[PDB]
């Protein structure tokens, strides 16, 4: 895979072996970073990234279910009680929870 | 300024006009992606990235449902069918995304 990217780059430029291997390794590192971010996006798409959207009103807290075994229960709502807020509980969406948190964070 | 330096470094590695513009643009896109990744890491470290840790089974369970919010830090949790109360765990301030992903990889 890195060979194709290297060929593409040298073509864009013009459309010893140790440093060529170094370029290939940097290309592989870039591909790994892109793969990691794509994996994060896919996991958020499948909705097992429990980023509760904050930053009003209440919401439902559903039952506790364990994901892929482990005796640990996937959270269903995000609850906060300041000393004078009366406390609010907002459900974590099954849609892009991380993306929605980022959006309704960057809005303000 | 940075994209020209980056492609010049790549050329130096290689050698021991529209194409140049396209190369600079793709370098700009890659560095912007890296910059956003670093921004996410910075936000996670500062603590402004609530990611919910998986609730331990050993949770003692509260004395009432979540809406009562009885024992508060911005925890996240779910209602336990055992006694109608909900078992809540605070969001780790330090590294929430990182800690949650570490727990996910541990299983």
């Amino acid at each position, epitope marked *: 895979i890195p060979q194709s990217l290297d060929s593409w780059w040298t073509s864009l430029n013009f459309l010893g072996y140790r440093w060529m291997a170094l370029r290939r390794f940097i290309i592989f590192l870039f591909i790994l970073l892109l793969a990691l971010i794509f994996l994060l996006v896919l996991l958020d798409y499948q909705g097992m990234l429990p980023v509760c959207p904050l930053i009003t009103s209440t919401g439902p807290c*559903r*039952t506790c279910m*364990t994901t892929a075994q482990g*005796t640990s229960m996937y959270p269903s709502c995000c609850c906060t009680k300041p000393s004078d807020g009366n406390c609010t509980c907002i459900p974590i969406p099954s849609s892009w929870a991380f993306g929605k948190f980022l959006w309704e964070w960057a809005s303000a | 300024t940075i994209p020209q330096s980056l492609d010049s470094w790549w050329t130096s590695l290689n050698f021991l006009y529209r194409w140049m513009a396209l190369r600079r643009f793709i370098i700009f896109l890659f560095i912007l992606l890296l910059a956003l990744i670093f921004l996410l890491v910075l936000l996670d470290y500062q603590g402004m990235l609530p990611v919910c840790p998986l609730i331990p*089974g050993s949770s003692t369970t509260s004395t009432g449902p979540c809406r009562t919010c009885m024992t508060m830090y911005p925890s996240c949790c779910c*209602t336990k*069918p*055992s*006694d109608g109360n909900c078992t809540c765990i605070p969001i780790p301030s330090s590294w929430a995304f990182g800690k949650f992903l570490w727990e996910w990889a541990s299983a």
Partner: antibody
Amino acid sequence: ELQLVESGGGWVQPGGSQRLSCAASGRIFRSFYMSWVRQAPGKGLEWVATINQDGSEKLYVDSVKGRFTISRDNAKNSLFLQMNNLRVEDTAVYYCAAWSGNSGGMDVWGQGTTVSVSS
Amino acid sequence: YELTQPPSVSVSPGQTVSIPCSGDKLGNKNVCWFQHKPGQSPVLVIYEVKYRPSGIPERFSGSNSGNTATLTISGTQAMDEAAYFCQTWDSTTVVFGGGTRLTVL
């Protein structure tokens, strides 16, 4: 979602034993709590038993504590309630309910197996 | 735990029924409402006092005020006729209500 089918109901003498089986169809059965809820003939719903994901926590109603044993197996995706030494008042229709995480209550229910203890 | 419902409440089609579910300290607890039809498995109508599962018509709604709860059904259709049970937790055992029979006249 989940298809729950109960079985193992029929005529039995008092003091006998029955093994009611809920054969949930789907791997997602493994994640939810399950429960057996009995509707007595001509009476209202009555809770019988509740089981968590692994079986560490088994809860019964005071009427049946020490007589019924709720259990589940995840390899076969089945929930078995073993009732021992039934009394004449245990006649009912037993329902297999699942506490789905997307509902917040006993939303998925089974057909309902008619137990009948009689002379 | 004594949890009480009326034996039955019946209305003509169209009106709105407020099924009561009186139990002590019931405001603190959260209440679920199940719809059982003769010959059919119970259907979860309300959870967490005021919330409906996916697919339940918006007609159903829940309420709680002190030592009592209520299931409000608006625009009662000919299918709604059923039995309705309110369920809560005493401490760790779930207690169901007596169940009210709603009949569509």
